[PDB]
Design an enzyme around this catalytic site. Sequence first.
Site, PDB file in Angstrom:
ATOM      1  CG  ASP A 178      -9.368   7.585   6.760  1.00 20.01           C
ATOM      2  OD1 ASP A 178      -9.051   8.614   7.396  1.00 20.01           O
ATOM      3  OD2 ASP A 178      -9.670   7.594   5.554  1.00 20.01           O
ATOM      4  CB  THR A 179     -13.494   3.696   3.693  1.00 12.21           C
ATOM      5  OG1 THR A 179     -14.273   4.899   3.679  1.00 12.21           O
ATOM      6  CG2 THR A 179     -14.077   2.734   4.708  1.00 12.21           C
ATOM      7  N   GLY A 180     -11.131   6.099   3.143  1.00 14.37           N
ATOM      8  CA  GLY A 180     -10.498   6.928   2.127  1.00 14.37           C
ATOM      9  C   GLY A 180      -8.980   6.811   2.131  1.00 14.37           C
TER      10      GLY A 180
HETATM   11  N1  LIG Z   1     -12.136  17.234   9.470  1.00 16.52           N
HETATM   12  C1  LIG Z   1     -11.841  16.055   8.885  1.00 16.52           C
HETATM   13  O1  LIG Z   1     -12.628  15.110   8.846  1.00 16.52           O
HETATM   14  C2  LIG Z   1     -10.457  15.930   8.246  1.00 16.52           C
HETATM   15  C3  LIG Z   1     -10.253  16.909   7.057  1.00 16.52           C
HETATM   16  C4  LIG Z   1      -8.987  16.606   6.213  1.00 16.52           C
HETATM   17  C5  LIG Z   1      -9.308  15.432   5.227  1.00 16.52           C
HETATM   18  C6  LIG Z   1      -9.138  14.025   5.796  1.00 16.52           C
HETATM   19  C7  LIG Z   1     -10.168  13.080   6.256  1.00 16.52           C
HETATM   20  N2  LIG Z   1      -9.472  11.950   6.574  1.00 16.52           N
HETATM   21  C8  LIG Z   1      -8.026  11.923   6.449  1.00 16.52           C
HETATM   22  C9  LIG Z   1      -7.374  11.717   7.822  1.00 16.52           C
HETATM   23  C10 LIG Z   1      -7.779  12.664   8.923  1.00 16.52           C
HETATM   24  C11 LIG Z   1      -7.062  13.930   9.101  1.00 16.52           C
HETATM   25  C12 LIG Z   1      -7.514  14.823  10.153  1.00 16.52           C
HETATM   26  C13 LIG Z   1      -8.631  14.415  11.005  1.00 16.52           C
HETATM   27  C14 LIG Z   1      -9.326  13.148  10.840  1.00 16.52           C
HETATM   28  C15 LIG Z   1      -8.887  12.267   9.781  1.00 16.52           C
HETATM   29  C16 LIG Z   1      -7.524  10.905   5.393  1.00 16.52           C
HETATM   30  C17 LIG Z   1      -8.398  10.866   4.135  1.00 16.52           C
HETATM   31  O2  LIG Z   1      -9.182   9.780   4.179  1.00 16.52           O
HETATM   32  C18 LIG Z   1      -7.525  10.864   2.871  1.00 16.52           C
HETATM   33  C19 LIG Z   1      -8.404  10.982   1.609  1.00 16.52           C
HETATM   34  C20 LIG Z   1      -7.554  11.140   0.367  1.00 16.52           C
HETATM   35  C21 LIG Z   1      -6.926  12.447   0.144  1.00 16.52           C
HETATM   36  C22 LIG Z   1      -6.062  12.614  -1.010  1.00 16.52           C
HETATM   37  C23 LIG Z   1      -5.849  11.462  -1.879  1.00 16.52           C
HETATM   38  C24 LIG Z   1      -6.514  10.179  -1.695  1.00 16.52           C
HETATM   39  C25 LIG Z   1      -7.390  10.015  -0.547  1.00 16.52           C
HETATM   40  N3  LIG Z   1      -6.725   9.630   2.783  1.00 16.52           N
HETATM   41  C26 LIG Z   1      -5.394   9.639   2.953  1.00 16.52           C
HETATM   42  O3  LIG Z   1      -4.770  10.606   3.298  1.00 16.52           O
HETATM   43  O4  LIG Z   1      -4.822   8.469   2.681  1.00 16.52           O
HETATM   44  C27 LIG Z   1      -3.373   8.434   2.740  1.00 16.52           C
HETATM   45  C28 LIG Z   1      -2.906   8.118   4.138  1.00 16.52           C
HETATM   46  C29 LIG Z   1      -3.078   6.651   4.468  1.00 16.52           C
HETATM   47  O5  LIG Z   1      -3.180   6.085   3.151  1.00 16.52           O
HETATM   48  C30 LIG Z   1      -2.826   7.111   2.184  1.00 16.52           C
HETATM   49  C31 LIG Z   1      -7.834  13.365   5.926  1.00 16.52           C
HETATM   50  O6  LIG Z   1      -6.779  13.889   5.712  1.00 16.52           O
HETATM   51  C32 LIG Z   1     -10.727  15.785   4.976  1.00 16.52           C
HETATM   52  C33 LIG Z   1     -11.523  15.387   3.831  1.00 16.52           C
HETATM   53  C34 LIG Z   1     -12.852  15.955   3.766  1.00 16.52           C
HETATM   54  C35 LIG Z   1     -13.366  16.839   4.782  1.00 16.52           C
HETATM   55  C36 LIG Z   1     -12.576  17.219   5.931  1.00 16.52           C
HETATM   56  C37 LIG Z   1     -11.240  16.654   5.998  1.00 16.52           C
END
Ligand SMILES: NC(=O)C[C@H]1C[C@@H](C2=CN[C@@](Cc3ccccc3)(C[C@H](O)[C@H](Cc3ccccc3)NC(=O)O[C@H]3CCOC3)C2=O)c2ccccc21
Lengths: 99, 99
Positions: free
Chosen positions: A25-27
């Site tokens: 997860d690069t985000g």
């Molecule tokens: N359906 C989907 O892909 C997931 C949903 C929710 C959201 C999601 C994707 N990945 C995550 C994880 C995830 C959750 C559920 C399923 C797969 C991966 C993390 C995302 O990269 C955030 C990014 C972030 C958010 C707020 C502030 C800064 C960065 N980073 C983050 O929380 O970093 C924290 C946790 C670890 O280090 C700190 C996330 O919450 C997402 C975003 C766009 C489209 C759809 C989605």
Amino acid sequence: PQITLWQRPLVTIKIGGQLKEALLDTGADDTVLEEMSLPGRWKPKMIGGIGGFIKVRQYDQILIEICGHKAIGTVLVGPTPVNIIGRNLLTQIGCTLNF
Amino acid sequence: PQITLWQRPLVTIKIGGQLKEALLDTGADDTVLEEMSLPGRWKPKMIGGIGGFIKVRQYDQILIEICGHKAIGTVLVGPTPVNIIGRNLLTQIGCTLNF
Ligand SMILES: NC(=O)C[C@H]1C[C@@H](C2=CN[C@@](Cc3ccccc3)(C[C@H](O)[C@H](Cc3ccccc3)NC(=O)O[C@H]3CCOC3)C2=O)c2ccccc21
């Protein structure tokens, strides 16, 4: 290796002698794993996510293997949808984005 | 280019006639941007992760430019803490993870 993104970049990690599935997860600044037992003391950590900030347990200098690559660093444990491998460990294994 | 992960991988994007800063996120299926107006019809959707779920509007077939690379795809709009470019668009610009 080179990982394309047509599907979730899920890999197998090894921690505490056990295999788990995790997402590169690069985000994510940090690495957060689902509830599990880790050794040593932990400290409080607030992390921000898509839906808000939450409290997690922070363990430092934890041995973790990511797709065969050995790393030793900070691992957070808390209520996360999936095991997340963040930048702190992606940098340790020499991961970069390319296009 | 090759983007390091020592820092958040932020890039400039162009969408709806405006330039925005966005995070390249291999851990996101979709692309979600902070509240903004987009043309065409949309459908409600809920996405969830760390901190919980947020409600967003889903617009399909949206034109976007990421680092000079043109692509088209679904863009979600809602109360996200940061603009996120997900896999649905990362694939179109040929972005990959390497280590
Ligand atoms: N359906 C989907 O892909 C997931 C949903 C929710 C959201 C999601 C994707 N990945 C995550 C994880 C995830 C959750 C559920 C399923 C797969 C991966 C993390 C995302 O990269 C955030 C990014 C972030 C958010 C707020 C502030 C800064 C960065 N980073 C983050 O929380 O970093 C924290 C946790 C670890 O280090 C700190 C996330 O919450 C997402 C975003 C766009 C489209 C759809 C989605």
